[PDB]
Symmetry: C3
Amino acid sequence: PALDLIRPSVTAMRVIASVNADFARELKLPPHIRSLGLISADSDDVTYIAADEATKQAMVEVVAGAAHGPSPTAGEVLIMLGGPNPAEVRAGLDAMIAHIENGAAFQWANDAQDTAFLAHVVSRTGSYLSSTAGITLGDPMAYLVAPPLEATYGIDAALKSADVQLATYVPPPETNYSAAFLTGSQAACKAACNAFTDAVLEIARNPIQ
Amino acid sequence: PALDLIRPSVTAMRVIASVNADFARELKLPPHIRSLGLISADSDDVTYIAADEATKQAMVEVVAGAAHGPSPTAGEVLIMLGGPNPAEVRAGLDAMIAHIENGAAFQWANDAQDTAFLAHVVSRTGSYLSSTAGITLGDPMAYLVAPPLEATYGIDAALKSADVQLATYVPPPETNYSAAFLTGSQAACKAACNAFTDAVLEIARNPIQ
Amino acid sequence: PALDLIRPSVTAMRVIASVNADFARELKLPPHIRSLGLISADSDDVTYIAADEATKQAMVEVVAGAAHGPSPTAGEVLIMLGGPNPAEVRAGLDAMIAHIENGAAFQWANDAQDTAFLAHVVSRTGSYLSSTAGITLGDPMAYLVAPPLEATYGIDAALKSADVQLATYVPPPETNYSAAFLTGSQAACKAACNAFTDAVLEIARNPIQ
Ligand SMILES: [Cl-]
Ligand SMILES: [Cl-]
Ligand SMILES: [Cl-]
């Protein structure tokens, strides 16, 4: 039913202990990045949040305008974690696995379960999400995802309900899911997530008034 | 069967009476644009034509290289209508609804109904379709859509049969539907639509000679 | 089962004996290109290889960062062959047909047949594949395609096993299939294809260790 969690899955995982030199150049890896962790999953934004969380928990970095939406996805969502040795890379992958299976999650917008949404607060951003313009390393953030009409209406509602700012905005392309990042205090990001959720549920209930 | 109409549907609709100031800046709305109409449908090009028609019927504007094809689409096709007040915005949405449900339409190219096409004359363009290079505000236009091989062959056939010009051309990306806009007198655009249709039916009948 | 061939199909074909002048300008055709061959198929990379092969077998040319993957595809994969007359164009299309139906092929990575891959050596490149940076006209080449995690791991394995170089690399976008082109001697490209295949089979067997 409405507000029940969707739980994604990890589809494949491998570690490259020592990247080939020619491949390292083509990937433009920094000299300190020797090893590479590869993980694929069937959800877009939950994987992205898990990746950012890994950057705080291990000595790894990820090697905005991407695909967004819940599981199952059309294909593989791949993240490449780069690190100084295979142990740090494995620590990063373990953090990602843990957060994909028991971290942020999409929810159903209605009882029919034809529409989903994500409304999640990242209390402290790592190096991946803070790469976006307007998001500072360590600051909190509201991560909002919905179908484009619901997203637009919800974003407007969130900005009106809470003391938050739109970090950056790129409008929807035909797409199935669009995302938005809001910035402000931790409590204000929570209020924005609650207001975003109410707007999405309202439209999912009665899409044509 | 062949030439029967496909009828799309409106999936969701909302009006924002007064857009949040921060959101207005991110959407780069002109100062006279105070209100916002949101409508989503399951067809690409029929919705786009309906949007252009709304710009003539109300004081609204839409806030080429997009998705093209018939219903049902993979996700939501969203249009945002911007206007000076909620009454004009509602007038625009009412015009769109009317033209989505009884205006331009895709048709089946064969009796098996595995392939569709659009061949429609816009007798007087509004401000949305005339934003394309080579299309002048108020002038007529042939709006042609088909699968990429059929589209290419049909466009060549249309240009040969009627006194029309290719307004602008971007080749197909793997895609399922590509579009073309032709320019000329109202009668010449009609002849181009008839010739485009004949070529599509011919290929849909006997794709490999 | 694993390593069994996937066989694609030709979906539609037409020849334009004499391209309309306005259409020729929009397609930016050279003055010697008078005729146009249109062919659509349900596989991405097998069609691309067939197109390159046609450039050696006929007086035609094709009018990297495209769609990749096996059949069936979401829509039509179109190739336009441009040539000096309809006879040369027909010779090009006949070469493409022959190579789509009995040339390069994707294979299943596992017995469940949920994942496919392509590992093929082009012994002598024509004018189409050699348009890529780092590929010289007439030189051999390894053409590698797999799902993004398998592709990444396989490319690293290929570079380590054989005396080959990565011609050019663009990382995966959410995607279902990514491609890589390797350069070197004919025998070294074969060894790279064998090593790429072993890595893909290994992951397809045991994706999570
Ligand atoms: Cl990072
Ligand atoms: Cl407009
Ligand atoms: Cl070529």
